[PDB]
Nucleic acid binder design. Structure first.
Ligand code: MG
Ligand code: MG
Lengths: 780, 778
DNA sequence: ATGTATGTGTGTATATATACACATATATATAT
DNA sequence: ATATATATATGTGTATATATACACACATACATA
C-alpha cells in the first residue's frame, strides 16, 4: 500500500534509484513547509524538487527498539534477535521499512545488496529544540544502529541543520543565527542594550516564512550532514537507550561537556558528524532539560510550567479577580511568560493546578476552580474541556504564602532578552513536602507523600521563636542531623488508618462485615486510589471472582460506598485461602485494602541539577536558611528606601513653604529652573528609583540615586500646594521615620534579623489555610 | 454502545419508572453524573436507580431529508430510509438503548410497555444552538418515525438558566433564559456597576452550589411535549427538503409570547410542539443567518468583525507578532466571544491567508509562517501553535479611520461594549472580495469586481469637477447604469467572456501533436489544483484517451502535463464537440466555469436583504458614508470650540497665578471659590480632553458643568515661559483648524467632499504598495 | 433519453477521538 | 517451588484524527417507453 502521509519521488526504485532522497519530517506542518520549498520551480534552479526527493512523516516521537527486543542465542552458535509484537505493529516503522524496502535478515554489507533499496539515503528534517533534535533523532539513530549498523558505517542516515534563533539588527539584511538556547543566552547577557534587535524563536519548521525558506533552500545541499560511527559508540547507545537506569543516573548527574575547536572545525568543514559526539551533546542536553522540566524544585515545590502559571496568574488577576476561561488564561500565560511549547499541555496543567477533592495532588491549590473539575471516581480525569470551565486566583492564600514584597528580590529566568519568572519562589512554609506527587523523568523518579500541617508548624515555630522550649535542642539536632519532633504523614480528608511496620508506612481501607446477608460494605479505599480502577482490578482477578455474585457501586461524589455480594456460604472459605498475617487482615488481603507509602525524594536544586534526599527532615533543613537570608535582604532594602524617601519629601515640604519667595514663574525653561534650584540647597534626586525601586539591588539603589535632577519638585501639581496637603505630608514623613526606627530595631534581634515578622506570617498563613479548608477551598 | 451509563432498573419490572437523560457531549455527562450522586445532600432527588445517561454526539442527523416514501401495489406508501441514515452511530445507540421498533406504531399501551425506558429526556444546552437546533432535530426524528409517542408524553426536556445575575448583598440571583430578554433588561438599567453577570455557555459551566440548587428542584423543572394538529406543516417547513418555504417564513422576526400561553406553560407544565418551533427553532435560524451571512456595508460577518476590533485593540502599543491561539484568546476575552476556540482559530487563519485564488483580496492581517497554497485550496496551513499574524497597520488605518469608529452603533454583550454593528469603509468592500457560503434558507456567493471600476464610480459620485458627475446623479435617480463594472481579473491569467446573462472564466492549454502532449498552464477562477486533477481521473470517458498525468506546478503557478495514447486527438475532436462558447479541448479538460452570483446580505438593525446586481449594493452603500462624514465634522467643530474655551483660561491663569497666590489657601474648596470669583469657567476636564463615545448633545450638555480640575491639576513644569509660548501657538493652530472646519462644512455637493477624495487617494496607494510587496509591506 | 438517487464543497457552528517517551512497584500468566 | 515477558499509571512534552447542519450548480450511475 501507499503508506499514510507519503509522497514518493518520481525515480523511486528505478534505474537511478540510488540518487534519491527521503526527507522524513516530524509531522504535517513540516511537510507543508517541504512541499512549499521543493516546488520552487524556476526561482531555484540549483535546489531539489520531486524528481529526486520524497516525503514521509515520523508520527511525533519514534518508538525505541533498544528495549522492545530480545536476543536468542541459537544452538548453532549464531544468535538471533526477535522483535516484540508491539514493535512489529507500529505504523510508522512498518511504513518506513515499506518505503525504503529494507530487510531484517540482510546485513547490507556488500553493494549489490545495498543496491536493492528503493532509494538510497534517509534525511531526517526535524526541529532544532532539544525535544526534536536530541530525542527523536537519537531514537532514529538507535533504531538504525540496533538493526543495520552497516548503513551507518557506509553512510545512509543524514539530516538538515536549520536555525532555532535568528536575531535581526535594524538596517542590516543578514541576521545572526543560533542553533542552541544557552548559546543565545550567553551571547545576549554580554550585550548592553537589546532595544534595537528582534529575537525570533522557531519551534518547528512551519514558523519560517517565505523570504527565509527561499534563503534556506538556495543552500540545501550545503546544510545536509552525514553520520559516521566509531568503536566508542555502542556503549553510549546502551547507556542512553538501554533498559537499565543506573548507567543513566551516573552519567546524567554531570552537565554537558562543550566542544573543542578541532571537532567544530572538522564538522563545519567536511560535514560529517560522529554518532558518539552527537549523543554526548544533543541527547544529553535533552535529558538534562527534561529533568529540569519534569522534576520539582525543593524550595517552592513546583515545576517550571507551574511556576510560569503562578507568575502569570499573579499578574493576570492583579486589577480585579474576575474569572476567565482556561484557554484564555492559557493564552495570557503563554504570551507574557514566554512559554515556548504547545498549548494543550499548558491547558492540562492549568486544569490540574486548580483541582481540589479528596485525594488530589495539590492540597493547597493556587487557583479557585469554577465549573466541573473532575472527581475522586476517575482520578480527576473527567474534568470539563477548557472551553467550559474557569479559574480565578485564590488571592489571600497567595498573598500570605508568597509575599509580594519578596518577589522583587529573587533571581529571575530571562527568556529571549527580557525577564519571565523567578528561578524559584521561597514560601513562608516548606511547601515542597506538603503535597503529593508521582512522576517519572529521565534517569530518576519523583514521588512524595504529604506531611501533617501541625508537625511542620511545630518544627518551624521551634526553629524561629525564641521562647519555645524546643529552641536550642532543635539547633543541636540540626547540627547533628537527628530527629526529635515527629514528622508524620497527613491524614486530612482521609478516614482510614495508618501504621508503621519497620521502615515504611502502610495505609488501610475500611470494610464492614455482615453475615446476615453475606455482604461486605466497603466504605473507604487507601490513599490516592481511584474508585473505578479499583473496581475493575477487583473484577479481573479470577481467584477473587469465585466468591462474589455481584459488585455494585453506591458512592457519592466525595465518599466511597462500594457493595459486594458473596456466593452463599462463602465467608468461611476465604480465611483458609487468604491467610491473615499480623500486618493485614484476611479481608484486607482479599479486597486489596492496603498500600505502602514508598517515597522517591529526588528534586532539582538552584543552579540546576539533581539533588537526592533520604528523609523529609533533610528537605526542611535545606529549606530554612533561604527564608532566613531573604528576610535579612528585605529589611536592609526597606531601610535604604526609607532613608531615601525621608530625604525626598523633606525638600518637597520646604519648596511648598518657599514657592512664593522663589517665584518659579519668572524663569525661562527647565535649565534655568534647575540652576536656580541648585543654588538654594535642594538635593538632586532620582525620582523614578525612589518612587518605584522595582528590582534594584542596594548598591544599585544607593549608586544611581544621588545622580538625577529636579524632576521630583517640578512635577508638583498646584493641587498639593495647599495647607491640608502640608499637614498630610508632614504626618506621613513622621510615619516613615517611625517606620525607619522600627526597621533598624528589627535588624538586630535574636536569633537572627527578622524573627518576629516570620512568626506573624506563620500565623497569617495558618488562618488562611484554616479558612480555605472550611469553605471547601472556595473562600466565600 | 459507548458513553452509556445503564440505569439499575432498565428493562425490568419497573422499566417504565425510568428516565434517560440524553446529554449532548461528555462534559455534560460529567455534570449529570456529579448531580445524580448527591446521596444525602439531595434526599428528594433522582439517582441511578431509575435514570440513565447517553450522549447525543453533537448535532443529530435529520431524517426528513434522508428518507423516501415509496408506493407499492396495494395502495400504501412505505417509508424506506437511506443507507447513510441507517448507519449513524448515535441513532443506532438510542434505538438499541430504548428498544424501539421501526415497523411498530405504539398506538396501544400494550405496545407502549415493550420499551426499556419510560421517557427520553433531552438535557441540552440553553444557548440558542443547543436549545433550538438539535432539540428540533430530535423532535423531527421522533415525529417522522413515531408520532404516537409525542402524542402520549415520551419526549421530555429540562430547563436551565442561560444568564444568572448576582446582586451585591442579596442572596437570590436573577435568571434569564433567553439572551434578548437579558439585553432588554440590561438596557433598562442605569447603574450596573455592582452586578456580576454570568453567562453559562454549556451546562458543564455550572458551579457546585448552582448544581445543588438545580438538583433540589429537578422534577420542578422538567417539561413535556404535546403534539398539535398544526404541527405537521411546521415540521415540514423547518426541516423539509424545500427551501422556498423557509425563505418565505424567515423574513419576519420571532413572534413574542403572550401572557396566557406563558402562564399555561409555567403552570400545567407542558409544551406544544408548534409553539416551540415558532420561537426556539426560528430564533436559532435567524441567529445562524446573522452569524453566517455578511453585512453589505463592511463586507464581513460577525466573527470577522470581532477579530478586526480585537486586532485593532491588541496591536495598538507596538505591532509585535502574536501566535494564532494567543491572539484568539485575546479576542475571545475582550470581545466577549461566546463559542468554541477551534472555529475562532480557523477564522483567524483564513482571515490572514493570501494566495492567488483566496477569499480575501485585501486581508486584515499580515500572515507570518506557513499559510497554505493554491494547490490544496488553502487547507494546507500550519497548526495554530506554529503560525503568526500581525496587523496590516497602514491599510487598516486608511480604510477604517480611527476617528470614525467613535461614531458608530455598538454591540453590547452582558452590559459592556464589544464591537460595532458594522464598519463603514472608505470603499465598498462587500463587492471587492469573494465568498461562497450556505446558511439557513439563503445562499451567499460573490465574485469580486475590478478596483479601477469602483474607483471611477466613487470619484464620479463625489468629485464635482469630474465630467461624469450629474450623469451619474441622474442614473442614481432613475436606476440606470452608465459606467461599467467588470469582474476582477487580477492575479488571474486565463480569460473572461460575457455570453448572454453571465460571465465565464477560461483556463489556458498548450498543445503539441509531435509528442501527444497538452500542457495546462492556467486553471479557471478559484479551482484547486489537486481537486481538479483527482476530478479528471474519475471520469472513465476521459481516461480512455489519456495515459499519464504529471504535475510540475510551482508554489503559485500552474503547470500540468498530460500524456495521450497515440491516435486519439482526432477522436477527441470528433467526439467532444465544439460549440462557439467552449472549445473541444476545453470541453475535454474541464477548462471553463460560470461566474454565478447569489447576492444575499444582512442589513443594519437585522434581517436579510437580497440584491440583484452590484450597482444596487454600491448605491445602497454611498449615503451611509456621506452622513458619517457630516457627523464627524460636527463633532470636530464642537470639540474645537470647547478646547479653545478651555485653554484660554489656563493661559491667563499662568499670567495671573503669580499674584493670585494659590499656595496661601487652605484646601481646594476655598481655591475653587476664589477661582470662580475671578471669572474662570467651570469645565469638565475629563470629557473635553477625551471625548470617547459622547454624542454632540451630551457633549454640549454636560461639559460646561464640571469643576476646576483643569486648572488645579497643573504641574509646576507648565508655569515656564516656553510652555506659555507653546500653549499660545497651540491656541493659534486650533483657531486655524476651527476656521478650516467651518469652511469645509459648507462645501458642495455635501459636507466633507474633499476629505473623502483624499481618503480615496490614500487607500489606493496603500493597496498599490501592498500589492507590490506580496502583501507583506516591506 | 428522462426520472430518479447519491456526492463532495465553502464558513461558522456543535460535540468528541489517538500514537509515542520516561521509572518503578504491583499484578498476571508459564516452566524449570 | 521460580525467571521471564507483558501491562498499567503518573506529569510534561512531541505529533495527528473525525461526525453533524445549511444551499445549489454540477458531476457521475441505471432506468425510461
Ligand atoms: Mg517542535
Ligand atoms: Mg451548546
Amino acid at each position: 500500500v501507499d503508506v499514510d502521509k507519503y509522497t514518493r519521488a518520481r525515480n523511486a526504485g528505478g534505474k537511478r534509484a540510488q540518487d534519491c532522497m527521503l526527507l522524513a519530517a516530524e509531522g504535517d506542518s513540516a511537510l507543508s513547509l517541504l512541499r512549499t520549498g521543493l516546488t520552487l520551480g524556476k526561482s531555484n534552479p540549483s535546489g531539489p524538487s520531486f524528481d529526486f526527493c520524497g516525503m514521509i512523516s515520523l508520527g511525533g516521537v519514534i518508538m525505541n527498539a533498544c528495549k522492545k527486543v530480545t536476543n536468542i542465542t541459537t544452538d548453532s552458535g549464531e544468535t538471533i534477535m526477535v522483535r516484540n509484537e508491539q514493535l512489529t505493529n507500529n505504523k510508522v516503522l512498518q511504513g518506513i521499512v515499506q518505503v525504503l524496502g529494507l530487510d531484517f535478515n540482510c546485513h547490507y554489507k556488500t553493494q549489490e545488496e545495498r543496491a536493492k533499496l528503493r532509494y538510497g539515503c534517509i534525511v531526517a528534517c526535524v526541529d532544532q529544540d532539544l525535544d526534536g533534535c536530541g530525542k527523536i533523532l537519537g531514537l532514529l539513530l538507535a533504531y538504525f544502529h540496533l538493526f543495520w549498523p552497516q548503513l551507518i558505517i557506509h553512510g545512509f542516515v543524514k539530516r538538515l541543520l536549520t536555525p532555532l534563533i535568528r536575531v535581526y539588527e535594524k538596517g542590516k539584511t543578514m541576521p545572526v543565527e543560533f542553533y542552541y538556547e544557552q548559546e543565545f543566552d550567553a551571547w545576549a547577557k554580554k550585550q548592553t542594550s537589546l532595544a534595537n534587535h528582534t529575537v525570533k524563536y522557531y519551534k518547528g519548521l512551519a514558523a519560517h516564512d517565505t523570504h527565509e525558506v527561499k534563503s534556506m533552500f538556495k543552500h540545501f545541499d550545503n546544510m545536509v550532514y552525514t553520520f559516521t560511527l566509531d568503536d566508542s559508540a555502542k556503549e553510549l547507545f546502551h547507556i542512553y537507550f538501554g533498559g537499565e537506569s543506573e548507567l543513566r543516573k551516573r552519567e546524567l548527574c554531570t552537565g554537558v561537556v562543550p566542544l573543542t575547536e578541532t571537532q567544530t572545525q572538522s564538522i563545519h568543514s567536511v560535514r560529517r558528524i560522529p554518532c558518539s559526539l552527537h549523543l554526548q551533546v544533543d541527547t544529553k542536553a535533552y535529558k538534562l532539560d527534561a529533568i529540569e522540566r519534569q522534576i520539582p524544585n525543593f524550595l517552592d515545590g513546583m515545576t517550571r510550567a507551574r511556576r510560569k502559571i503562578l507568575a502569570g496568574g499573579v499578574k493576570c488577576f492583579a486589577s480585579n479577580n474576575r474569572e476567565r476561561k482556561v484557554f484564555q488564561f492559557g493564552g495570557y500565560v503563554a504570551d507574557h511568560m514566554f512559554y515556548h511549547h504547545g498549548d494543550m499541555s499548558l491547558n492540562t496543567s492549568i486544569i490540574k493546578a486548580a483541582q481540589y477533592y479528596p485525594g488530589s495532588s495539590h492540597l493547597y491549590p493556587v487557583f479557585i476552580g469554577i465549573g466541573s473539575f473532575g472527581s475522586r471516581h476517575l482520578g480527576g480525569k473527567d474534568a470539563g474541556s477548557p472551553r467550559y470551565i474557569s479559574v480565578q486566583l485564590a488571592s489571600e492564600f497567595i498573598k500570605t504564602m508568597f509575599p509580594a514584597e519578596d518577589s522583587w528580590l529573587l533571581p529571575y529566568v530571562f527568556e529571549d532578552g527580557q525577564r519571565a519568572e523567578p528561578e524559584y519562589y521561597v514560601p513562608v512554609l516548606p511547601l515542597a513536602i506538603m503535597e503529593y506527587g508521582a512522576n517519572p523523568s529521565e534517569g530518576w523518579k519523583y514521588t512524595t507523600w504529604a506531611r501533617q500541617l501541625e508537625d511542620i508548624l511545630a518544627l518551624v515555630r521551634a526553629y524561629v521563636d525564641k521562647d519555645n522550649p524546643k529552641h536550642e535542642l532543635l539547633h543541636y539536632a540540626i547540627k547533628h542531623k537527628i530527629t526529635i519532633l515527629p514528622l508524620r504523614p497527613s491524614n486530612y480528608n482521609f478516614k482510614g488508618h495508618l501504621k508503621r511496620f519497620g521502615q515504611y508506612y502502610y495505609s488501610y481501607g475500611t470494610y464492614v462485615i455482615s453475615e446476615q446477608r453475606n455482604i461486605i460494605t466497603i466504605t473507604e479505599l487507601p490513599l490516592r486510589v481511584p474508585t473505578v480502577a479499583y473496581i475493575e482490578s477487583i473484577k479481573k482477578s479470577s481467584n477473587r471472582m469465585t466468591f462474589i455474585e455481584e459488585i455494585i457501586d453506591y458512592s457519592s461524589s466525595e465518599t466511597i460506598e462500594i457493595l459486594v455480594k458473596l456466593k452463599p456460604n462463602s465467608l468461611n472459605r476465604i480465611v483458609e485461602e487468604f491467610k491473615e498475617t499480623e500486618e493485614q487482615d484476611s479481608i484486607e488481603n482479599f479486597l486489596r485494602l492496603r498500600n505502602c507509602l514508598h517515597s522517591h525524594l529526588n528534586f532539582v536544586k538552584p543552579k540546576g541539577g539533581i539533588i537526592e534526599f533520604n528523609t523529609y527532615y533533610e528537605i526542611l533543613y535545606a529549606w530554612l536558611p533561604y527564608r532566613r537570608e531573604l528576610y535579612q535582604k528585605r529589611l536592609m532594602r526597606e531601610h535604604a528606601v526609607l532613608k531615601l524617601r525621608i530625604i525626598m519629601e523633606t525638600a518637597i515640604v520646604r519648596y511648598i513653604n518657599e514657592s512664593a519667595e522663589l517665584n518659579l514663574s519668572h524663569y525661562e525653561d527647565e535649565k534655568e529652573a534647575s540652576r536656580i534650584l541648585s543654588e538654594h540647597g535642594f538635593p538632586p534626586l532620582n525620582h523614578t528609583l525612589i518612587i518605584s525601586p522595582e528590582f534594584a539591588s542596594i548598591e544599585e539603589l544607593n549608586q544611581k540615586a544621588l545622580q538625577g535632577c529636579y524632576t521630583y519638585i517640578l512635577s508638583l501639581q498646584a493641587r498639593e500646594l495647599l495647607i491640608a496637603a502640608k499637614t498630610r505630608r508632614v504626618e506621613k514623613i513622621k510615619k516613615m521615620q517611625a517606620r525607619l526606627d522600627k526597621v533598624e530595631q528589627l535588624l538586630q534581634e535574636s536569633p537572627f534579623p527578622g524573627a518576629s515578622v516570620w512568626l506573624e506570617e506563620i500565623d497569617a498563613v495558618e488562618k488562611a489555610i484554616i479558612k480555605g479548608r472550611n469553605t471547601q477551598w472556595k473562600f466565600h
